[PDB]
Write a protein that binds this ligand. Structure first.
Ligand SMILES: Cc1cc2nc3c(=O)[nH]c(=O)nc-3n(C[C@H](O)[C@H](O)[C@H](O)COP(=O)(O)O)c2cc1C
Ligand code: SF4
Ligand code: SF4
Ligand code: SF4
Ligand code: FES
Ligand code: FES
Ligand SMILES: [Zn+2]
Lengths: 187, 233, 220, 108, 435
C-alpha cells in the first residue's frame, strides 16, 4: 500500500494514500471539530466545521474532504489563528439559529454540538436577532421524532439513509435557511 | 401519528389531492414517456416531469410527486427533495396568470418595490397569494436577467419591460378581467401552458420577442456614431 | 526513557470510555501523556538544586539514580529510579546545600495503563533552611510493587508507606512493619487501586434506585 | 440531579401534552424525589437549575423514624399554590410561550 | 475604445433569430471551418484565441476544453470503452444585473447553437445540453425553435455536414434556482437532483454529468466561439489585451440613461460606456456600481476609469464577473441595495453549507434592523466579521458572492452605514424610482 508522509501542525506522520486530513489528525491525536464528517459515510464537506489551514491553499480546507498528499503542511486550530477563527465563526453561525433546548433536549450531555461549541465556540452569543423556528417535534416514523430547529443540516442522516442503507425515505428539502430533513408527505 | 410537516408551516408543504384518476395518469404517462426518452439517464427528466405535473394541476401535489417517483423509480421524499428546492415549482393553487414583480436590488430600487406595493394595494393580495377570481397570483421574483429593462414584471414568465406602477396596475387589471396586454418580449399564455412548455411539450414557434430598446441600445449607438463595427480581418 | 510518559490512551471524541453515544466520533486516538523531561535550564532554584544533586552524586551514580526531571507549573518533580531512592534521599536530606530535612509524606497513585510503572510513590520534600521544595517520584510495576522504604532517612514516611501500602499494595521493602493502618488487617484488596471497585450501593428511591457513580456512565 | 455529588435527586421527565401540561415547553419533571438521607445540602442542584424551578428555603426542621419517609417526592417538595395560581395541569397563559416564561413576562 | 458589435450586429434586423438571417451573415460558416479542422485542432484554435470564460470564473476556455480526456490515438483496449463526453451550455442567467445572455439567446440563438456544436465537436461529446433557467420562457421557446431548425438543417443529429460527427442537442428548462448556475449544481439539477454544488474533486472534466467527463460553458463564451472560428484568431486578439483578448457584452442597467446591452472590447472603462449611454441618470452623479453581478465587490466613482477586464478588476479588488454593470446614483442608499442583495442571496442559498446558509440569514436580519431604526454601532462590526466568516469558508462561491457586497459597501460607505444608525434610512425611496 502506498504511504504518504505529512505534517499536521508541527508534528509529522505517515498515512496510507487517500487518507483524509481529518482521519490523519485523528490518528495523530488532534481533535478537529466536525459535524457532517463520518468515517463510514462518503465525505460531503457541508457543515464547513472541519476547516484547517493548508500551506499553498488560499482558502481554508475542509479536512473531512481533503485527501492527504505528500509533503502537505497542515495547521489546525491548535497552531493556526486563521483556522481557529474560521472554525469558531462556523460554530457561531451553527448556533445562532439553534434552540435554547439543551435542558429539554434528549441529546443533552451526549451532544457533539455542545461539546464542540465548548471546545471551539464563542463563550457568549452575538446573535440578538430572531431565531429561525419550526414546529417541533414532528414524527417521521413510529419510532423517530424530528426536531428541525436543532438540525444542523449535516446530512448525516440522509447520507446514511442513501449510502449505507438503500432507504432514502428522508432527504433534505426546501432551500436555504428553510432547508430541512424531511419525508415530503405522509409516507 | 401526524407524520411529516405540519400543514400550517411556512413555505406551504406539498399538499392537495393524494392521487390522480386513471385517465389523468394515462395522459401523464404518455407525456412522461416522451420526456424520459430524451435523456441518457432517466432521472435527468425529473425536473421536466415536475413541470409536467405542475401543468396537470395548478401546483405541485402529492399526486404529482407520487407520479414522478413512480415514473423515475425514485421514492417520495426523493422527488420531494428536488421539488421543494426550486422556486418555479409553486406549492399552492396558482391562478391563470402568475404575475411576478422583479423585486431584486436593481429592479426593486428602479421602481420594482413601488410596483409590488401598488399591485398589493390594487389586487388587495399579498405576494404568493392568488386573487379571489383565481386568475392572477401575485408574487415577487428575484433578478430575471432583464435588468436593463428595469423595472420588469413577469407574467407566466413572459417579460413586461419598463413597468411603472400605473402601467403594472393596468396590466394586472387587464389580466384579471379581460384581454391580457401583450408582453413586451414574449407571447403570453396561461400558467398551465407555460408549465407544459417548460416540460418541452409545447410548440417552440411562439410569436413575439422583438429585441426591444435596451437590447438594441448598443448597436443603435454604434450605428449613430458610425463606429467601426469591429476589426475586419 | 526521555519520551513522554503515557498513563492512559484515550480514544474517541468527548471523553467516551466506550463505544460512544453518537456514531462516527469514536476514531480519535489521543494518548494521555504526563509532562515529559524538562529541558535543562530549569526555572528558579530548581537549576541549583539539580546541579548540587548531580555534583554530590557521581555522574554515573546521578545518571543511574535520577530517571527523569520534570518542571510542571513551576514545581519540580524528580523521577528517581527505584532501588536508588534511599541513596538520593540521604543525599537530599544531608547535603548542606540541599538539606531537605522535612519530608511531608508518601502518596500513592495508580496508573493501570502505565506498563511496568503502574504504581507511583510521590515524596514531597521541603527544605526549611533554603525555603525550597521538590517532589520525588518512584515508579514500580504492578508485578513487583516493591520500593525501598525511606524509614531510615525520613521517619515521617512511616504510616505513609503504610497508608500508601494499605491503599495500593506498594510493599516499601525494609519498612519496620508494613501493616494496614486505615483498612482492617482482614480486608481484601487495596481500595485506591483503579481496579478496586468503589463498593457503593444503589441509592434507594420510591420505585427506583440510582446505582453508584462508578457503575453509571461518565465522560472524561 | 446531574450535579448532585451524593446522587440525592431522582428526576424523570415527561412530555407536556396539550391534554395535561405541567410546565412551559416540551418537558416537565413528573417524578422528582430527593433522598434527604443522601442530601448534603451543598446547593449544587440549585446552582445547576436553568429555570430556578429548584430553590432552597430556610426551612430546616426535618426528621423521621423511617428511612423511606425522608425520601421526599414531588408532592412534598412543590411550593404551595399561591393566590392567583391555578392547578398545574392547565394550558399556558394566553398569548405566551416558553420564552415568555423564562424572560419573566408572565402574570397571574 | 470603440463599442464593437459582433454578436449584436444582426439585431435591429427583421426576425434576426431565424436560421435564414443567421446564414445571411456567414452563419454556420464557423462550424464548417471547425469541421475542416481536427477536434484537437479546434481546441488549440480556441486556446490560442485566448477566449476566457464569460461567466464569473473567467477561466481560459481552451484549457477547459483540453482538460477532457479523449484517448487521442491512445486506445489500448475497448474494454474500458471510455465514457461519453457531455457539453453543457450554462444558459442559466440569474446573477443580479446579469442580463447579457438572455438578450443574446432571445435575438440570435443560432450563435449559441453553432458554438455549442463546435464545442461538442472539439471535446468529442455526442450529447449536448442547453440548461436554461425557466423564468425566461421566451428565451426557452426561441432556443427550442433554433435547435429544431438546426436539426432540420442537418447541423445536429448524426453525420453533421457529412463529417461523421454526431451530436444530439437537448434544451433542458431548469426550474428556479440561482445556485444552479454554478457548475456541479447545474449538473446536479440536470441529473434530476437538488441543485447543490458537488464536492470537488472530482472535477466535471472527469466526473461531470452522470459521472462522465463534462465541460460547462456560459452561453456568452460558446456564442463567441463561432465568431472567432471565422475571422481567425488574430481578429479576436485584436480586441482587449493579451491577458483579456476579445469582446464581451456589458449589461448597462440602473441609474443610467439609455440602459442596455453594449458589445465592447474587454477593458473598456466604465467612463466610455457611460458616455455612450449618455452618462448616469440626468441630474444625479454616480454613487456606486457592480462591475459584474451582485457577486462582485462594489465600485465607486474613484474606479470609474478602471478598464473592465479581468486583470483590471482584480487589480481593483473586484471581479469582472458577468459584466452586469449595475449603476446606482446619489439617490440610492447603499445599505438599501446591499440589504436587497443579501435578501436575494438568502433566498437563493442552496442551504448545503453552514457558512452561507446561516450567515446570509443573519446578515439579512442585521440589514433589516439597519434599514429600520434598530441599527447599532456594533452592528457594522458584526456585519464585517460575519462576512469574513462566510467569505472563503463557504462550500461554493455563492457565499463569497453574498459576502462581497457587504464587505465592499462597508469599506466604501462606512459613513453611510453609520448614518443609518441615527434612526434608519434617511434616503427617500421615491427619489430613486427612476420615474
Ligand atoms: C452561485 C454561482 C452562480 C453562478 N451562476 C452562473 C450563471 O448563471 N451562468 C454562468 O454562466 N456561470 C455561472 N456561474 C459560474 C459557473 O461556475 C461556471 O464557471 C460557468 O457557468 C461556466 O464557465 P465559463 O463561463 O468559463 O464557460 C456561477 C457560479 C456560482 C458560484
Ligand atoms: S437530522 Fe440529519 S441533517 Fe439534521 S443534524 Fe441530524 S443527522 Fe444532521
Ligand atoms: S443540596 Fe441539592 S445538590 Fe446538594 S446534595 Fe442536596 S439535593 Fe444534591
Ligand atoms: S455557499 Fe454553501 S449554502 Fe450557499 S449556495 Fe453555495 S453550497 Fe449552498
Ligand atoms: S465535517 Fe468537514 S466540512 Fe463538515
Ligand atoms: S434585477 Fe430585475 S431583472 Fe435583474
Ligand atoms: Zn438605507
Amino acid at each position: 500500500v502506498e504511504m504518504v508522509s505529512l505534517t499536521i501542525d508541527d508534528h509529522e506522520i505517515s498515512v496510507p494514500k487517500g487518507t483524509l486530513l481529518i482521519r490523519a489528525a485523528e490518528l495523530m491525536g488532534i481533535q478537529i471539530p466536525r459535524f457532517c464528517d463520518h468515517p463510514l459515510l462518503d465525505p460531503v464537506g457541508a457543515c464547513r466545521q472541519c476547516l484547517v489551514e493548508v500551506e499553498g491553499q488560499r482558502k481554508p480546507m475542509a479536512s473531512c474532504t481533503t485527501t492527504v498528499m505528500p509533503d502537505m503542511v497542515v495547521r489546525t486550530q491548535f497552531t493556526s489563528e486563521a483556522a481557529d477563527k474560521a472554525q469558531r465563526g462556523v460554530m457561531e453561525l451553527l448556533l445562532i439559529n439553534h434552540p435554547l433546548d439543551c435542558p429539554i433536549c434528549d441529546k443533552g450531555g451526549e451532544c457533539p454540538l455542545q461539546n464542540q461549541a465548548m471546545s471551539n465556540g464563542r463563550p457568549e452569543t452575538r446573535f440578538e436577532d430572531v431565531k429561525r423556528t419550526f414546529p417541533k417535534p414532528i414524527s417521521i416514523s413510529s419510532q423517530v421524532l424530528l426536531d428541525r430547529e436543532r438540525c444542523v443540516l449535516c446530512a448525516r442522516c440522509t447520507r446514511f439513509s442513501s449510502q449505507i442503507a438503500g432507504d432514502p425515505f428522508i432527504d433534505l428539502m426546501e432551500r436555504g435557511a428553510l432547508q430541512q430533513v424531511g419525508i415530503g408527505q405522509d409516507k | 401519528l401526524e407524520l411529516g410537516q405540519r400543514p400550517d408551516e411556512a413555505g406551504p408543504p406539498i399538499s392537495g389531492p393524494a392521487t390522480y384518476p386513471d385517465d389523468v395518469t394515462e395522459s401523464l404517462r404518455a407525456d412522461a414517456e416522451q420526456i424520459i426518452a430524451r435523456y441518457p439517464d432517466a432521472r435527468s427528466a425529473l425536473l421536466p416531469l415536475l413541470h409536467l405535473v405542475q401543468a396537470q394541476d395548478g401546483y405541485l401535489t402529492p399526486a404529482g410527486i407520487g407520479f414522478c417517483a413512480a415514473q423515475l423509480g425514485l421514492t417520495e421524499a426523493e422527488v420531494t427533495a428536488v421539488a421543494t428546492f426550486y422556486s418555479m415549482y409553486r406549492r399552492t393553487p396558482t391562478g391563470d396568470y402568475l404575475v411576478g414583480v422583479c423585486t431584486n436590488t436593481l429592479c426593486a430600487i428602479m421602481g420594482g418595490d413601488a410596483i409590488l406595493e401598488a399591485l398589493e394595494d390594487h389586487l388587495g393580495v399579498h405576494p404568493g397569494q392568488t386573487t379571489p377570481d383565481g386568475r392572477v397570483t401575485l408574487e415577487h421574483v428575484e433578478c430575471n436577467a432583464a435588468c436593463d429593462y428595469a423595472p420588469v414584471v413577469m407574467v407566466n414568465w413572459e417579460f413586461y419591460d419598463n413597468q411603472t406602477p400605473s402601467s403594472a396596475r393596468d396590466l394586472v387589471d387587464g389580466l384579471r378581467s379581460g384581454s391580457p396586454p401583450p408582453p413586451t418580449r414574449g407571447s403570453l399564455c396561461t400558467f398551465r401552458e407555460t408549465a407544459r412548455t417548460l416540460a418541452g411539450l409545447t410548440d417552440p414557434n411562439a410569436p413575439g420577442g422583438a429585441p426591444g430598446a435596451a437590447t438594441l441600445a448598443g448597436l443603435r449607438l454604434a450605428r449613430e456614431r458610425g463606429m467601426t463595427a469591429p476589426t475586419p480581418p | 526513557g526521555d519520551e513522554p510518559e503515557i498513563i492512559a490512551v484515550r480514544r474517541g471524541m468527548f471523553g467516551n470510555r466506550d463505544t460512544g453515544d453518537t456514531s462516527g466520533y469514536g476514531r480519535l486516538v489521543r494518548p494521555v501523556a504526563l509532562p515529559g523531561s524538562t529541558p535543562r535550564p530549569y526555572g528558579g532554584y530548581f537549576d541549583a538544586v539539580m546541579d548540587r544533586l548531580a555534583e554530590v552524586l557521581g555522574e554515573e551514580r546521578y545518571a543511574m539514580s535520577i530517571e527523569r526531571v520534570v518542571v510542571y507549573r513551576d514545581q519540580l518533580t524528580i523521577e528517581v529510579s527505584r532501588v536508588q531512592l534511599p541513596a538520593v534521599a540521604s543525599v537530599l536530606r544531608d547535603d548542606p546545600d540541599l538539606r531537605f530535612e522535612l519530608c511531608l509524606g508518601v502518596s500513592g497513585v495508580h496508573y493501570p495503563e502505565d506498563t511496568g510503572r503502574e504504581l507511583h510513590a510521590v515524596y514531597p520534600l521541603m527544605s526549611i533552611t533554603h525555603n525550597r521544595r521538590i517532589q520525588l517520584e518512584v515508579a514500580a510495576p504492578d508485578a513487583d510493587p516493591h520500593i525501598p522504604s525511606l524509614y531510615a532517612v525520613y521517619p515521617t514516611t512511616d504510616w505513609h508507606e503504610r497508608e500508601t501500602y494499605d491503599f495500593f499494595g506498594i510493599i516499601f521493602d525494609g519498612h519496620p512493619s508494613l501493616t494496614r493502618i486505615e483498612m482492617p488487617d482482614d480486608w481484601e484488596g487495596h481500595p485506591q487501586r483503579k481496579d478496586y471497585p468503589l463498593g457503593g450501593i444503589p441509592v434507594e428511591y420510591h420505585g427506583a434506585q440510582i446505582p453508584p457513580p462508578d457503575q453509571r456512565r461518565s465522560y472524561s | 440531579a446531574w450535579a448532585c455529588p451524593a446522587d440525592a435527586i431522582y428526576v424523570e421527565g415527561a412530555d407536556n401534552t396539550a391534554d395535561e401540561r405541567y410546565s412551559p415547553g416540551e418537558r416537565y419533571g413528573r417524578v422528582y424525589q430527593i433522598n434527604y438521607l443522601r442530601c448534603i445540602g451543598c446547593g449544587l442542584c440549585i446552582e445547576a437549575c436553568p429555570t430556578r424551578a429548584l430553590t432552597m428555603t430556610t426551612e430546616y426542621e426535618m426528621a423521621d423514624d423511617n428511612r423511606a419517609d425522608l425520601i421526599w417526592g414531588k408532592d412534598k417538595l412543590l411550593a404551595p399554590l399561591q393566590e392567583g395560581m391555578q392547578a398545574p395541569p392547565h394550558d399556558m397563559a394566553p398569548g405566551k410561550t416558553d420564552d415568555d416564561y423564562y424572560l419573566g413576562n408572565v402574570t397571574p | 475604445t470603440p463599442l464593437t458589435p459582433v454578436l449584436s450586429r444582426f439585431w435591429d434586423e427583421p426576425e434576426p433569430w431565424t436560421l435564414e438571417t443567421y446564414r445571411r451573415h456567414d452563419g454556420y460558416q464557423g462550424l464548417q471551418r471547425a469541421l475542416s479542422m481536427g477536434p484537437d485542432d479546434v481546441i488549440a484554435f480556441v486556446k490560442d484565441s485566448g477566449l476566457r470564460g464569460r461567466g464569473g470564473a473567467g477561466f481560459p476556455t481552451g484549457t477547459k476544453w483540453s482538460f477532457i480526456p479523449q484517448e487521442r490515438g491512445d486506445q489500448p483496449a475497448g474494454g474500458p470503452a471510455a465514457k461519453p463526453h457531455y457539453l453543457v451550455i450554462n444558459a442559466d442567467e440569474s446573477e443580479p444585473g446579469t442580463c447579457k445572455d438572455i438578450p443574446l439567446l432571445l435575438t440570435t440563438p443560432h450563435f449559441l447553437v453553432e458554438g455549442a456544436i463546435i464545442a461538442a465537436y472539439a471535446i468529442r461529446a455526442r450529447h449536448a445540453f442547453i440548461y436554461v433557467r425557466g423564468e425566461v420562457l421566451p428565451v426557452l421557446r426561441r432556443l427550442q425553435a433554433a435547435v429544431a431548425e438546426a436539426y432540420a438543417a442537418g447541423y445536429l443529429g448524426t453525420d453533421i455536414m457529412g463529417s461523421g460527427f454526431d451530436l444530439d442537442l437537448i434544451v433542458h428548462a431548469g426550474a428556479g434556482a440561482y445556485i444552479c448556475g454554478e457548475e456541479t449544481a447545474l449538473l446536479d439539477s440536470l441529473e434530476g437532483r437538488r441543485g447543490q454544488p458537488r464536492l470537488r474533486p472530482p472535477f466535471p472534466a472527469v466526473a461531470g454529468l452522470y459521472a462522465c467527463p463534462t465541460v460547462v460553458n456560459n452561453v456568452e463564451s460558446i456564442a463567441s466561439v463561432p465568431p472567432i472560428m471565422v475571422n481567425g484568431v488574430d481578429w479576436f486578439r485584436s480586441m482587449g489585451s493579451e491577458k483579456s483578448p476579445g469582446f464581451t457584452l456589458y449589461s448597462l442597467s440602473g441609474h443610467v440613461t439609455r440602459p442596455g446591452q453594449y458589445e465592447a472590447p474587454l477593458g473598456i472603462t466604465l467612463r466610455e460606456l457611460l458616455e455612450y449611454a449618455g452618462g448616469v441618470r440626468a441630474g444625479h452623479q454616480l454613487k456606486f456600481w457592480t462591475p459584474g453581478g451582485s457577486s462582485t465587490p462594489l465600485l465607486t466613482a474613484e474606479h470609474l476609469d478602471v478598464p473592465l477586464d479581468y486583470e483590471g478588476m482584480a487589480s481593483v479588488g473586484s471581479m469582472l464577473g458577468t459584466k452586469a454593470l449595475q449603476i446606482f446614483d446619489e439617490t440610492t442608499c447603499v445599505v438599501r441595495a446591499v440589504r436587497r442583495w443579501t435578501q436575494f442571496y438568502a433566498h437563493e442559498s442552496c442551504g448545503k453549507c453552514t457558512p452561507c446558509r446561516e450567515g446570509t440569514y443573519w446578515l439579512a436580519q442585521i440589514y433589516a434592523r439597519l434599514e429600520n431604526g434598530a441599527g447599532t454601532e456594533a452592528d457594522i462590526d458584526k456585519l464585517l466579521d460575519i462576512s469574513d466568516n462566510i467569505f472563503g469558508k463557504s462550500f461554493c462561491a455563492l457565499g463569497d458572492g453574498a459576502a462581497s457586497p457587504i464587505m465592499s459597501s462597508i469599506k466604501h460607505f462606512r459613513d453611510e452605514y453609520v448614518a443609518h444608525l441615527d434612526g434608519g434610512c434617511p434616503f427617500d425611496p421615491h427619489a430613486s424610482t427612476l420615474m
